[PDB]
A = this chain, B = another copy of it.
């Protein structure tokens, strides 16, 4: 009889809660009272009860904790205690959880008498924190009025909440905390929670204010990651950083690393990023064993109201798809906020699960500190202007109780004002060798072309693949997969950790690498032969990710930030789906060092090639990456510097390469780690050269004394007699092979020279100038399997014309411009390719003008 009523309250208590600070605007966007909650004695008929039952004593179930060292209670006691627990300033949304132990723990924490009481020292400390926050806010206001400082006015209880979280984490065992937070309230945290020299904060208020830099305090260590103004675009980055620190510190269960994130109410229910980030929480490869989310519900986004912003009651619904409990609290009552923070910290330290806490508050001023909010919401601010601040009412309550005397509070205010005034007055290298000796290469080749496990049986096709691998190894020949194994194993020997993530990377999207072997008979038997290469070596991890291209890339980037001695690779199924995560490339990878001055070295792998498989299963948009480079096309650098290659690579944002041969792909990954500094790397991997019969290289290019070749000159009869060569030809990728075959078909050998360019960013001016001067009489041309308005023409042409003294035109030999990456008609592809190949190996296509 009573069990149904208690369940009904545990379901619908948060809907009738006075979480509203102003008293006017509602929190759940509905003022109706559902019939489940007994708002009056007339509603007992819904459960079949009546006014005669309000005095009969009822026995509590095993899922109720209001008894407090008491078994049965009069129904009036149950109703009063249940209203106090669920329908006052705290509303708990947790019964969507199917686990029983977590539900019982939450009930015990939030449904027992005499557990929320504080001590006088805690009240004094809370008063001190509230005074610090409020006086800092008014000092910023009165010393800087005509500014846009995004104030935290009408919600100062945030700072004590964060301090309570950090203190509970410290006493629970945590020794490292990583925090992410939007702009609203940044300076308060930077001055009170992550304590910093106030003179430095005042100095940085006037200059460098726009940039949200990184703040570190080192005795729990606190780090505040830099975040951009894009909303909710830094959660996966924080999760990746937390995972990397957990892995490096040896914490398998993450008992000493913690993650805290702050969100606004409007963005937590309007961005699809939160969905993707929440789905990464439980995946075995992306699980940081717990994050604490704090969402500030000021009940407004700029000038947009809550009812025209979302299709859900609360802005906290995304967290319920993963069974993460949610706590909504009224910011007016500070003790409730403190207890909720303590409960959330205990929950994270116990169950290693995400938890979200919602701070219901209001906004005292406009969106900016000089905006006019009466234009759009008159009633809201008319009601706002008739309410006391939280500090004033808290101080009055404490004075009435007798905890603090008025002179002490006044002295505290005066001394903190003097501290602020005093602070304000005071305020104003060579390229390594990447080769390997033959025994290491032979050992890796033999281990990779077999199965280490004794009774491990594989498929027949896989057996044929391994036999072909062994035949290649014994003949001193390497293909794409073998080159990948050799590079990764060589790095693993030196102690460098390697992580490879993305979609379908364990088997390969084209089924070419087979890095993970599966047993046909046993259900979960799995063998990774690479861990068996050497007795002592760095770990190796390969992971399959979800379909989100946005959260996984951010996670990988955050992981790459922790340590330089690590090789993190992200693989996309096709080069056309990277645009789903453009924001991550736009704000985090592109200007990571220009603003924020921190180093990263993530490797991005993008398959790219035109083979008729579709208008959008073809091409990786390299012209989008090539335009985001801090290089001036009109200036030719000094080509006679001490090194140039390493100096040029030092002054750039990232590197862009398009590898066609396995040897260069082997050397690039080694050069990524062996260098002193780190920079992001973008690689355009082929799609049809994996099985190509002549896409192979010998071991002689993998031996000691060999460096990565940024530009591969032409080898053949053309080089033997260079004065007779016409039509000097440049290419980048598979287009080389398609040319060479035709050069054999048309008997153009000795009349056309074809050269590749592996590295596009930065531009190799020196090597290109050296090889262009090799052929005095040859018409420069650029080949391309993409359209004119796509690919590398608009990037390469200015740089090629800069390399020479604009002494020669750079012609084009490729497809015509189009509004799509490729064509959807199979018949026209062959005609286009035949026309593309017509101009090459058929001279006088451009000499016809004269």
**Chain A residues near B (Cβ < 8 Å):** 3-4, 12, 34-35, 96, 98, 100, 148, 206-211, 228-231, 266-267, 269-276, 278-285, 301-305, 308-312, 317-318, 320-322, 371-372, 374-379, 382, 459, 461-462, 503-504, 506-507, 511, 514, 518-521, 523, 543-548, 550, 573, 577, 579-580, 582-583, 586-587, 590-591, 593-595, 613-617, 623-624, 627-632, 634, 653, 788-789, 794, 812, 816-820, 823-827
Contact = CB atoms under 8 A, between A and B. Distances in A.
A311 B320 CA distance: 12
A681 to B, nearest CB: 16
Given A210-B826, A304-B544, A507-B376, A820 B594 contact: yes
B824 A503 contact: no
B594 A521 contact: no
Contacts of A12: 98
Nearest to A654: B819
Given A272-B548, A309-B544, 6 more contacts: A271-B275, A272-B273, A279-B311, A279-B312, A321-B321, A372-B511
B631 A817 contact: yes
A272 B231 CA distance: 14
A231 B271 contact: no
B308 A285 contact: yes
A627 B630 contact: no
22 contacts: A96-B96, A207-B826, A208-B825, A210-B615, A266-B547, A270-B279, A270-B546, A271-B548, A272-B273, A275-B318, A283-B308, A301-B547, A304-B504, A317-B321, A375-B511, A375-B518, A378-B521, A579-B583, A582-B582, A595-B615, A624-B624, A627-B794
Contact of A794 (B546, B794, B817): B794
A819 to B, nearest CB: 4
A594 B321 contact: no
A547 B270 contact: yes
List 10 tightest A-B contacts by C-beta distance, closest first.
Answer: A272-B272, A270-B547, A211-B824, A282-B311, A594-B819, A210-B824, A210-B614, A591-B820, A317-B321, A275-B275
A718 to B, nearest CB: 28
Nearest to A99: B34
A547 B182 CA distance: 15
Nearest to A552: B270
A547 B275 contact: no
A274 B271 contact: no
A812 B285 CA distance: 50
Nearest to A525: B378
A553 to B, nearest CB: 13
Most buried by B among A304, A583, A632: A304
B819 A591 contact: yes
Contact of A207 (B320, B628, B825): B825
Given A271-B547, A375-B461, A631 B210 contact: no
A363 to B, nearest CB: 15
Nearest to A269: B279
A583 B285 CA distance: 27
Given A230-B577, A507-B376, A818-B594, A312 B301 contact: no
Contacts of A823: 210
Contacts of A590: 819-820
Contacts of A308: 283-285, 543-545
Contacts of A587: 616
Contact of A372 (B322, B461, B544, B630): B461
A507 B231 CA distance: 22
A9 B500 CA distance: 43
A545 B653 CA distance: 36
A548 B301 CA distance: 13
A13 to B, nearest CB: 13
